[PDB]
Symmetry: D2
Subunit: 330 residues, 4 copies
Amino acid sequence: QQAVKFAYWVPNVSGGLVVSRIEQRTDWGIDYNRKLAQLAEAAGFEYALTQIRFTAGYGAEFQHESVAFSHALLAATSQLKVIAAILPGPWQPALAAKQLATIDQLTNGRIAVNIVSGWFRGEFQAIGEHWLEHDERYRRSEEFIRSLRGIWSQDNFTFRGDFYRFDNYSLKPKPLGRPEIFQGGSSRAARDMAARVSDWYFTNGNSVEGIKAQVDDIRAKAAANHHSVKIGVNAFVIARDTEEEAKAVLAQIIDQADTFEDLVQYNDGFKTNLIGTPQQIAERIVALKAVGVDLVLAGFLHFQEEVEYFGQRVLPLVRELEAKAQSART
Amino acid sequence: QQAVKFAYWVPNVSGGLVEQRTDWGIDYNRKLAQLAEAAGFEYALTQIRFTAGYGAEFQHESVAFSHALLAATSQLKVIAAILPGPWQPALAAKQLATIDQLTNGRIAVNIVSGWFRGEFQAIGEHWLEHDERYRRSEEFIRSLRGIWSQDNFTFRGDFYRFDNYSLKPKPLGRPEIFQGGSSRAARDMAARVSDWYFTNGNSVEGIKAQVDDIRAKAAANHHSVKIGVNAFVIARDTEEEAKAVLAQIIDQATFEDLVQYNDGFKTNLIGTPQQIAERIVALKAVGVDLVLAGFLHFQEEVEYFGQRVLPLVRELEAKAQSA
Amino acid sequence: QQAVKFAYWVPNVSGGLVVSRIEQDWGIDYNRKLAQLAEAAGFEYALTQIRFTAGYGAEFQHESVAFSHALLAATSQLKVIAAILPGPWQPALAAKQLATIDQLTNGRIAVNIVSGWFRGEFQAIGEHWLEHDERYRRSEEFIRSLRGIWSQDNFTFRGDFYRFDNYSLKPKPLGRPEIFQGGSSRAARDMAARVSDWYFTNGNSVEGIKAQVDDIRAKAAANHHSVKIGVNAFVIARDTEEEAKAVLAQIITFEDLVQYNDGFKTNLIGTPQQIAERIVALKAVGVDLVLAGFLHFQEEVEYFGQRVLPLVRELEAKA
Amino acid sequence: QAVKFAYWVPNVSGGLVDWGIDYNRKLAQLAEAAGFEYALTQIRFTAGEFQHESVAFSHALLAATSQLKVIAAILPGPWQPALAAKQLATIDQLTNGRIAVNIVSGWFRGEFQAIGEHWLEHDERYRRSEEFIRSLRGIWSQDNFTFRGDFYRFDNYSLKPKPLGRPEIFQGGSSRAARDMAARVSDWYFTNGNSVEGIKAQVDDIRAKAAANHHSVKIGVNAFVIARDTEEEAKAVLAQIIDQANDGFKTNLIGTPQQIAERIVALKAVGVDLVLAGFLHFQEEVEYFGQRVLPLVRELEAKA
């Protein structure tokens, strides 16, 4: 029954929304992102989620390294937390645990981690990494996560895994706080891992009924393991003063595609339907809160403008609706 | 470039050496970096460690710490220590490149081949043979140079593979590659792929022999390498006070045994600022281009160095400028 | 083309046909006599199976390479195809061990490269489970390493899975060990069309096999590579057509049986005359070898060489 | 008990710098009739000219004998324990439990470099070998073996069928890492050839280490045996070897059969349980050993 938390996609990779050639006032540079992070902190966003890439993709020509970029965004803010994306394979838990702990010490305990298991083989092939089977990649990520928790929590951590080994490893200093572990993915392997070792699980964008079904499945598995997991939903937010204007922006995205079902195949956040007036979006967010959603991961076309707009128009309405819901229960 | 460059050991790990007014914390090191920049130091060299013990109970991660020190300075260059094994070149190349973009191209790299097998075993890494570790480090260095300067980089090594890898964005500048080690494998690698080579602390005559050997190997490979020397600087107003500080170090740990832990004492940069300045210029005459300085009390002695020892070095360099 | 060659599944793993509870051994004594009977029956190749952990159909398993050496030592002209599984196997050891056995057996050893089907077997032995197409990339580098080691001195190979640096294997094989390979996926038939000498196609009808043969030969021609084709088949040869159809009924639905053993789809069930006619019919669509599986190996293999195989030779003489 | 005897199988060319199968098949049969119990193969991958693969050669030598035991040489690295355990178990079933294993930690980096293997540090190669040995014992003895090592992992691995017997594990090496590993996991330890006084010191050291681990290990010594009818002829062979240019020479098993038999029993008194014999002409001197030297050793044992 706690307040809904909000996070935004850090555009630390170029291209933005690569499937549409619509003009976007978004940049991947540090100066743009420093201002965006400060705007997001002032707007009421709690988390900033970075993206991890090594090779250029179909539309994303430049990518800042996620961990170094997370440290830079943290140094430009005061209370905003930044989720550093980690890709097992090119990343190893020993370095990831120690680097995230140091950054946590330098930023007053405001760093989190998002473990991505990888979807594109070409990124691994370019950097000399082998391409493991789909479920096998999640076995390795689960050992990666358990290593992070053990290294961060024990004086003499020992782990005898199929992918990672530790023998009386002592990390000092440890994180100031307990870095939260975010994780996405929609496959059975992804939600079996989240139901065991993850703090946050990003469920795929869907309708209110579909998201409720995804929430019930993950909580049922988590309860069987006696594990607690909070749930966030990915959403592409188009907030305008009029419903027609917001629906016109969605039309321009499809019209300048490089159908509506094609956007879902690339970005599931459109199915969340956070498109319309600020009052409509706030009502749908609270409706998602009723089915178990604890966090909204927002994507925007013009990040600096729409994040500021979100904090002045949509977020206050969400808080007012939350107080209204809280007052009716008592 | 003709003037002798100066660098200091960043105390990003606890313990110092075998009472010290130094700290491994960020607040102490931010001030120390700013003091070192104003004192005339050009480089800051971090240390890399993974597990607690082996002398250092507390250890900050070198690359992130390098990013923090760079953000607190304007012209200071920071050398990030990298250890092949727990580190892989693809992540190292991309992380250092982004930090280079965020810090106006002021980051360098020091490739360490590792000394404690217990630290490797604790993190699940196998312990390769001595010369084999330098073969892996050399492939690590070649991958960094290739990734940072060309698109579609391809490398088929025994330790690392790359297949048409294009890193974007690339470093703003060209990160210099520093490297130490005194074994034959260490200086054969430096004479091929390294920009800077740290030679062990020794007498003026011994350092000249080490400089002549490394430059001969580099010339045979058609490779250019600059030379720095490690030194533990104890600068006091009187020679007796400096030798008394050295005595307190030995009595709270012999001199020969002290060298086996830190070779910087053999450089003999102990004494008055005039004595130290003369010995620094004498090393410049045998081919030394940089002095890597270690201190007992970093914040105080760095500031003392920039006000007392460094100006005397510049004056002695200008005296020979007329020739 | 040439005379149709025949091969049989070596039952070096227990269980036999696990899909059926019909009474039907994996010991060395049963297999030494089986190899000699197959050699006298006219079989040219013996195909071993590779397994590492107990379960997944076979509770007891003999090591394929050592078992191949034993069958070769008990015969004179029979060729044995040793099954090799990249992962637990490495090309350097495989190349040297098969070369020594080839020297000791007058060049009668071959190799069948298996890409693995059960991830539980790999996980039990500490091996990582690569993606499906990625496993075939490793198997191809495994095959290229064998060919280079067996044929060249100072071999150098810079692969993503295997490396060789100025390696010279001595002694080399007496002959050129043929490389057999199965698999039906796109990656399996792209690898076979490049580096494999023999390709095992899945059991199917005469029309379906012709389509599979044309596709693989078209890919092989594009690579300027020659590949011979064999087909897996479960042969039930009886004196009467009713008796042969009764054995299939006793084993059994039929569609579920094909999912376990695709050799039943080849439909080599019936009288020796019917089977011999279908074998020559398969030869017309490009089949060069028949991989035969049996319920009672010792009895049916000798029966095959006395009843079915002579008819195949007689039918080939007529045409 | 009775002193056991083994001979170096010349399955690699050069001898003491024939290697063919037909030569070694008859030599194995001659050695079995002469009273030798073990045959020790050598493992090589690269020319140093022609080397037979040790395990396949071991299977061939066993098939040519009835009771002779053959020790197959295994090199961790190019060999992995899962394949080694299963292959030796199958050969054990096919040869009436007459297969043994010699775990070699490797001495030449060029052999590993040619086959794509990394060159680990000296003591690190012995740590991997000890995990290799523990994996062999566990796979051969348990229904569901699990091992979480730094070099090898196993998760509920079930080998069926298991070896008919219990394959003995032989191991040499003289470094501290070599005899610390032998004192824990090895059945037999080959000590370097030396004098009777030096061998006793080596035997006492290894048995002291084995007692601390509560482990039992038998001891063999490498020796190059040159047995001739007269002492002068044996000393002439040694001169011809040196003039036309191996720790086994320090054992000093050179001379008449009576002198060698007396020295063998003296080695038995200091803890030696096996003699690893090297010869100049294998097919000839092995037959001579079994007819002239070995019976005298047995006679000296009966008197004791």
